[PDB]
Design a protein around this ligand. Structure first.
Ligand SMILES: Nc1ncnc2c1ncn2[C@@H]1O[C@H](COP(=O)(O)OP(=O)(O)OC[C@H]2O[C@H](O)[C@H](O)[C@@H]2O)[C@@H](O)[C@H]1O
Ligand SMILES: Nc1ncnc2c1ncn2[C@@H]1O[C@H](COP(=O)(O)OP(=O)(O)OC[C@H]2O[C@H](O)[C@H](O)[C@@H]2O)[C@@H](O)[C@H]1O
Ligand SMILES: [Mn+2]
Ligand SMILES: [Mn+2]
Ligand SMILES: [Mn+2]
Ligand SMILES: [Mn+2]
Ligand SMILES: [Mn+2]
Ligand SMILES: [Mn+2]
Lengths: 154, 154
């Protein structure tokens, strides 16, 4: 039995006994490689006061399934379309939120269109090095993309 | 300028203009391999209504730095100590929360002590297969541990 303290736009805050719980829409993220570069994005994120290295990601909207949301986000954030394959999912922080992320691979990317989101094509090796030297922060989606590449796409 | 709607035990809920922001303590997570098995844990997580596959993880407490928190969580959750090396960090979901996770590798594990947390030693290959067949869910920390192993520890 949850008690609702706040019903919002992209989250609700509930109490369930002693537990503080944030309900949040599910998300998608897209891993894409082209000529050895991974498709990252950056945007100011007010929650953290900086722009971490992410991969294209967004919330699933009403009526959409994860594959469709992934296609949409890739197009809206980067202007690209590709052949998408479902990889895996994860709960971002299941000690307090139900947000679940569905991760896809995109291949055979094509431009389907030519601004608050910066497109950052970068070799994953370089993303990991910049992070190890303190020069960029990762989101979970950016780190998952870099680790997935090193595991399976070299 | 944040406006606070809720100040809690492990989170605060704020508004910053149009943005809904969850402040949350930073976390640590520990990747550990022994005889080809990774050290996972599972526990009921009320936010998601199930027990996802995680790696040992916890919140940093007052006075602690990430390395110390990692040592503590490994001992409290699994009874083990090891030689810990910092790997990388990530923001769990920077579109709404500032929660940051610092991830460590543990080697040369030793038992330093002999219950709501289940210790699940499992080959990472098997964790990934069970997930692909729908049999277990991942937290971000569990997925990061599996991908890191496949990238760097085989
Ligand atoms: N939602 C909650 N609200 C209230 N208190 C809680 C909650 N969850 C647990 N506690 C209490 O707080 C203590 C927290 O136990 P520790 O081991 O340091 O942290 P962790 O494993 O939960 O979280 C580690 C990360 O893993 C996951 O991704 C999380 O989302 C974090 O990102 C518990 O013993 C409870 O008393
Ligand atoms: N904190 C917020 N509160 C209010 N509205 C917001 C917030 N953040 C953005 N919006 C609005 O909501 C729209 C969201 O844009 P989309 O691309 O679908 O999602 P994403 O990229 O933000 O989140 C995707 C994941 O990546 C990160 O890990 C996140 O935490 C998620 O887990 C924005 O255009 C804003 O209008
Ligand atoms: Mn987005
Ligand atoms: Mn978007
Ligand atoms: Mn742009
Ligand atoms: Mn824990
Ligand atoms: Mn603990
Ligand atoms: Mn136990």
């Amino acid at each position: 039995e949850r008690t609702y303290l706040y019903r919002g736009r992209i989250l609700n805050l509930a109490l369930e006994g002693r537990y503080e719980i944030v309900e949040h829409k599910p998300a998608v993220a897209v891993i894409a490689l082209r000529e050895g570069r991974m498709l990252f994005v950056r945007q100011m994120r007010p929650a953290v006061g900086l722009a971490p290295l992410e991969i294209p990601a967004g919330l699933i909207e009403p009526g959409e399934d994860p594959l469709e949301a992934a296609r949409r986000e890739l197009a809206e954030e980067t202007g690209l379309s590709g052949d998408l394959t479902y990889l895996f999912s994860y709960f971002v922080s299941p000690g307090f939120t139900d947000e679940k992320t569905h991760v896809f691979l995109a291949e055979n990317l094509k431009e389907v269109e030519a601004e608050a989101i910066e497109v950052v094509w970068m070799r994953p090796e370089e993303a990991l090095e910049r992070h190890q030297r303190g020069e960029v922060e990762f989101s979970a989606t950016g780190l998952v993309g870099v680790l997935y590449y090193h595991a399976f796409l070299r």
